[PDB]
Design a protein around this nucleic acid. Structure first.
Ligand code: MG
Length: 216
DNA sequence: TAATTACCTGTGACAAATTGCCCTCAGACGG
DNA sequence: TACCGTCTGAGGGCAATTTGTCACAGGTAAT
């Protein structure tokens, strides 16, 4: 089939800002970690390239820039507690191979109240906020492949660390919500719809229902 | 009744970031 | 054992799209 990512809901719902490339590598880190405690993971350019249909060159570029873009990035678990992703710079012992040092204090948060999806399910998504949304929906996914969940807008904004102009709702709709629904519906197997929940003039939650394209 | 205010909404416009894409050239390796 | 061609990937760039930010116009209700 394809690699099965599983992760604690606390990571699905953590507050952080990562790019697509960084989240993709992070999925591979979570897989390596799950196999076995040292916090040391490894990524091969050619393996990354084959997984995500990239060139060796563009794989190398994506890995390198994601990796140097991790510096200063932080992850927040709201039970809040903030951690750095990396506790040592990445480095390449051999050409085409990178070794990275994830904060070992993060190990128990990566590994019964959990979220799971196959990597082929997410590897064509481009917008990182749409990967965050697809992970949050997976957290509520039933065996058959459908689910329903109400997410609060403030919680969406804080958890996905959406940029400030998306606190203006028409921009939230236009540049995040609609784009990620279209992206998920066109690039994943999940078939996603939504409806808006209001309180007075303000929209407070977004209600997601979804099904799997193995059904009608 | 009318005008101003305090909310919301959508879209046009621009800036900034991100995309897959292109070209160069050395390291590793095997032939 | 030694040289060179090939594949790899570590770099430099790119224009076309996507994303992020804001001015502006319209609607409504409170006042
Ligand atoms: Mg790239």
């Amino acid at each position: 089939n394809s690699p099965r990512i599983v992760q604690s809901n606390d990571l699905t719902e953590a507050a952080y800002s990562l790019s697509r490339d960084q989240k993709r590598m992070l999925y591979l880190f979570v897989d390596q970690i799950r196999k076995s405690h040292d916090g040391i993971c490894e990524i091969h350019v050619a393996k990354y390239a084959e997984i995500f249909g990239l060139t060796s060159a563009e794989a190398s570029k994506d890995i390198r820039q994601a990796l140097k873009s991790f510096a200063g990035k932080e992850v927040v678990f709201y039970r809040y507690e903030s951690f750095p992703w990396f506790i040592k710079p990445a480095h390449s012992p051999s050409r085409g191979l990178y070794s990275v040092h994830i904060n070992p204090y993060l190990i128990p948060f990566f590994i019964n109240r959990f979220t799971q999806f196959r990597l082929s399910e997410t590897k064509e998504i481009t917008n990182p906020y749409a990967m965050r949304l697809y992970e949050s929906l997976c957290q509520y996914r039933k065996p058959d492949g459908s689910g329903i969940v109400s997410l609060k807008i403030d919680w969406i904004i804080e958890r996905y660390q959406l940029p400030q102009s998306y606190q203006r709702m028409p921009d939230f709709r236009r540049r995040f919500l609609q784009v990620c629904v279209n992206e998920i519906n066109s690039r994943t197997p999940m078939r996603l719809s939504y409806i808006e929940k209001k309180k007075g003039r303000q929209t407070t939650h977004i209600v997601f229902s979804f099904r799997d394209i193995t059904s009608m």
